[PDB]
Structure formats: structure tokens, C-alpha cells
């Protein structure tokens, strides 16, 4: 299937509070494997998935110096942004950037992207042509032209189509044995009394991995889209996930309701009846 | 590995 390599970058200025908190988090197929936090004791890049330990001392050193460099870079952008928006000097702000590559099973780059956001708002972003940018506002124009003035697009493209893809391939090696992990949800339905002679049927999906899952309720063949509530899938805390979905049915006629759980770890879509 | 960013 398709795999991706992505770094999530955050910088938040803390006026009066001192120098900005800087953080880099890397993800392979959506699983965290490296992180760097300026607000730690000895801020250095460290492995976040056990298989990343097979990388020698050099790797950690190299990425730490780089992160220390990326850190100052963003330290300056924070400031640059205050001018672009003529904003307060003592206000805290945030920059977030997502940067990475999605490549297919045939090794081709399906997607390369570097997206910026300032205070939770899209700022700039690399078009899928990996040659031009799309500014969000008039401040983003200043950077667009400036980045075009230093041919940044060309070099970002080189990383995206080469380095990123090349290092993705390398982590997949060290991580196949763990990245493929699959854990089926154990489902079940509970019954909760309601007034007006009505009832709540809650279908639960627990202990599953990865998070991608789907629950639906069925009333005589058709799946109820109406008054059906379902919570955000959530972390159990041990690497597994949980999620439930429920519907309100009249009492004495629930047995005409079936829950369906669709998870990739199941030989087949579970089917639950109260 | 990570990219070397270029300020705005």
C-alpha cells in the first residue's frame, strides 16, 4: 500500500516567557518515530518507536544539529510574521508546518507537501506541481515572492522527491516488523433504558489497531444515518483504540437493529445484534 | 530525515 513520511513542526513564541518553544515530530505511515522538544532537559532528537534504535549515534547527532538550526530559523519567522501583520509585540503566536511525502507501492511519489499555518490558519503551501506556492493572505504573498527569489521551490522539491522518499524506504525496512501490526477490535453491544418507553443500544469497538475503523447501525437492511451518535475514535493509552456508536430505538423492537464494525484486522466485517 | 527550512 501507500506509505508516507511526515514531520509536524511547531513554534510558539512566549513573550516575557523567553525564547519560543520549538518542536519537531516525525511520522511514518502516521506512527510517531522521532521527536525533538526544546523544552526538555537535554533537547536532542530521540527515537519514539523502538525500531528507530537501530540507527547509530551519528543519526541522532546529525538530526539534533539540524533541529537546532531549524529552531533558529523559525525563531526568526515568528518575528517576521509580527511585521507582516503589524501585530502586538507581547502576544504569543504559533507556526505549524506539515512537510512530507506519500509514495505508492510502486515507489512513485504520490504526494509531496509543505504546508504552513500561523495561529491555526493556513499561511502558505506548496502546490502539487511542487514548483509553485499558494499564499493564503497578503502576508503570504511577501513570502511567496521571497521564496521564489531564492529558488526555494527547487530545493524543497529535491527533498520531497528524493531525500524524503529515500529515507521513507529506509524506515520501512527497520519498521516493517512493527509497522504492519494489526489488532482486531473486540466488539459488543450494551443496553441502556430511556424514558418514553425508548432505548439506547451502544455498540463498542475496543482494543483495535490501527485507529481507522467504521461502525454503523442497521435497521432492516438500511444503515441508520439519522439520530445516530458516534464519538471520535480515542486512544486506550497502550497503543490500542476505542470507539462506540449508538442509536435510539423504541423498546420491544431493538432486535431489528444490527451493528457493523469494519476494521482491517478482521477476516470479515463483524456484525452485532443486541 | 528532516528538511532545512527557510524562514518566511
Amino acid at each position, epitope marked *: 500500500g501507500p506509505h508516507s513520511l511526515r514531520y509536524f513542526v511547531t513554534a510558539v513564541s512566549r513573550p516575557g516567557l523567553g525564547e519560543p518553544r520549538y518542536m519537531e515530530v516525525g511520522y511514518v505511515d502516521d506512527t510517531e518515530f522521532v521527536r525533538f522538544d526544546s523544552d526538555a532537559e537535554n533537547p536532542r532528537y530521540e527515537p519514539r518507536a523502538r525500531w528507530m534504535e537501530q540507527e547509530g549515534p551519528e543519526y541522532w547527532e546529525r538530526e539534533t544539529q539540524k533541529a537546532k538550526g531549524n529552531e533558529q530559523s523559525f525563531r526568526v519567522s515568528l518575528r517576521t510574521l509580527l511585521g507582516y501583520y503589524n501585530q502586538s509585540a507581547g502576544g504569543s503566536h504559533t507556526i505549524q508546518v506539515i512537510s512530507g511525502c506519500e509514495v505508492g507501492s510502486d515507489g512513485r511519489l504520490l504526494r509531496g507537501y509543505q504546508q504552513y499555518a500561523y495561529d491555526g490558519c493556513d499561511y502558505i503551501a506548496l502546490n502539487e506541481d511542487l514548483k509553485t506556492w499558494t499564499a493564503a493572505d497578503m502576508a503570504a504573498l511577501i513570502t511567496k515572492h521571497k521564496w521564489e527569489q531564492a529558488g526555494e521551490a527547487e530545493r524543497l522539491r529535491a527533498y520531497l522527491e528524493g531525500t524524503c522518499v529515500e529515507w521513507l524506504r529506509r524506515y520501512l525496512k527497520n519498521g516493517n516488523a512493527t509497522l504492519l501490526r494489526t489488532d482486531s477490535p473486540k466488539a459488543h453491544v450494551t443496553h441502556h433504558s430511556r424514558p418514553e418507553d425508548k432505548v439506547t443500544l451502544r455498540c463498542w469497538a475496543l482494543g483495535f489497531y490501527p485507529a481507522d475503523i467504521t461502525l454503523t447501525w442497521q435497521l432492516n437492511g438500511e444503515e441508520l444515518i439519522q439520530d445516530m451518535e458516534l464519538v471520535e475514535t480515542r486512544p486506550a493509552g497502550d497503543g490500542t483504540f476505542q470507539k462506540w456508536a449508538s442509536v435510539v430505538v423504541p423498546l420491544g423492537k431493538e432486535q431489528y437493529y444490527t451493528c457493523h464494525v469494519y476494521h482491517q484486522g478482521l477476516p470479515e466485517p463483524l456484525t452485532l445484534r443486541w | 530525515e528532516q528538511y532545512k527550512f*527557510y524562514s518566511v
Partner: T-cell receptor, first 111, second 111 residues
Framework: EAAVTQSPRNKVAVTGGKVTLSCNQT?????MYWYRQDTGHGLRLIHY???????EKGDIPDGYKASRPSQENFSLILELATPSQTSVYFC?????????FGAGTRLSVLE | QSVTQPDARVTVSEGASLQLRCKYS??????LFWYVQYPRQGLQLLLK??????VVQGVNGFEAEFSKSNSSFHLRKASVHWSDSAVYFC??????????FGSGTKVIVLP
């Protein structure tokens, strides 16, 4: 184009003297560098900057200082010149990858 | 991120071919660059390598080939003439956005 202008071109200063080499840039590049060139040492980094207000010691900062007043310029200050600093200096502006150099500045520190 | 040029001087005859040796030491793949320095001025880029195809073609018949194996980035020109006489620099970047320069190779091409 990618212009970078250093001033002065030449300088005859004496030990203990005060020397200011300045770099003006119209490249609108965020990063700037100050190097010195000597035989047997190729070019070596003294101080660079990630933007107006940024300054960070290079491989051989000792004896020099820098100030990044604005995007356009980056200065290398020599509050107390020593004959060891006699050399040719070059500032470069850079956009993350390749650097653009000014035409240099001969500096002679005499006793 | 380190780089070095083992041959301080290279003297070839006009119409001959040319190869400038460049070695880099580094745990990952670095950015690589080649610059030329004429008589009394700063440096000018001939070519760079960021990633991808190991053979990059630059200005005036110049071209290099990155070899991860050999950890090299040698410069070439099939046929040089007098005007190619100059000082050539190999450079590199990894950790930082600044370039680390090799000591340099002076090329003398005999007319």
C-alpha cells in the same frame, strides 16, 4: 544578478584599530555569511545570520563581531584588530542552498 | 559535513580533459557545490547537487558526479582552454545552511 556589495574594497588599519566591513544585499535573501579567505585554509565562516536581528558565531568567530540591522545588510565588526586578521573577506547571501558572494575586501592589519 | 581537495594545484595543457577531485566525509547525503574563483574576485557557482541524478551538468562544459560509494564529487570538463585557468572550490552543506569549503585547487591550463 544576485548582487552583494561589500564596502570598503580595501582597508589599511593598524593594530588596536577599529574596522567595520559592511555588506549590502539586494537579493532579499534571509541568510547572510561573512567569510575570510587565506592560503591553505580555503574560505572559512566567521559569522552568519538567519535574518534581521540574527547573528551566530561561525567556525572562527574569535576576534570578530557582527550585526544584522536589516535584511539588506550584515556587518563584521573588528573592535580591536590584530595582524592575524589581515586577509580577504567575503560576505554571501543565501537562500537555504547555494550562496552568492560579494567581490571581497582586502584588509591589512599593520603593527 | 566535511570536504577536502587533495590536489592543491593542477596543471593541464590546452585542449586536454580535466578532473578536479573532491572528497566529503559525512554520515548522510550532503548538499554539494562547485565554485570558480577568477583572479581578484569572489566565487561564482558552476553547479550544485541536492538530490537525485548523481550526474549534474553546470556552466561552461563543467559537470560533476556525486558518488555515495566513493564519497566523492569530482568536477570535469572534456576540453579546457586557457580561460579555464582559475581557482576551483568544492563546498558542502549538511547540518547547517552555511557552506563549508575545501582548501581549493588552482588550475593552470597551458596555452
Amino acid at each position: 544578478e544576485a548582487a552583494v556589495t561589500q564596502s570598503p574594497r580595501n582597508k589599511v588599519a593598524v593594530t588596536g584599530g577599529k574596522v567595520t566591513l559592511s555588506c549590502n544585499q539586494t537579493n532579499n535573501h534571509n541568510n547572510m555569511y561573512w567569510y575570510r579567505q587565506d592560503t591553505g585554509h580555503g574560505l572559512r565562516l566567521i559569522h552568519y545570520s538567519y535574518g534581521a536581528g540574527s547573528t551566530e558565531k561561525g567556525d572562527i568567530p574569535d576576534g570578530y563581531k557582527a550585526s544584522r540591522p536589516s535584511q539588506e545588510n550584515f556587518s563584521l565588526i573588528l573592535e580591536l584588530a590584530t595582524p592575524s586578521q589581515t586577509s580577504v573577506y567575503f560576505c554571501a547571501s543565501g537562500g537555504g542552498g547555494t550562496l552568492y558572494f560579494g567581490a571581497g575586501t582586502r584588509l591589512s592589519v599593520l603593527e | 559535513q566535511s570536504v577536502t581537495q587533495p590536489d592543491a594545484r593542477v596543471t593541464v595543457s590546452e585542449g586536454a580533459s580535466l578532473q578536479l577531485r573532491c572528497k566529503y566525509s559525512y554520515s548522510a547525503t550532503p548538499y554539494l557545490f562547485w565554485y570558480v574563483q577568477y583572479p581578484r574576485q569572489g566565487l561564482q557557482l558552476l553547479l550544485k547537487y541536492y538530490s537525485g541524478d548523481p550526474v549534474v551538468q553546470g556552466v561552461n562544459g563543467f559537470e560533476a558526479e556525486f558518488s555515495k560509494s566513493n564519497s566523492s564529487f569530482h568536477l570535469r570538463k572534456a576540453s579546457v582552454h586557457w580561460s579555464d585557468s582559475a581557482v576551483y572550490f568544492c563546498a558542502v552543506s549538511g547540518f547547517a545552511s552555511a557552506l563549508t569549503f575545501g582548501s581549493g585547487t588552482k588550475v593552470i591550463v597551458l596555452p
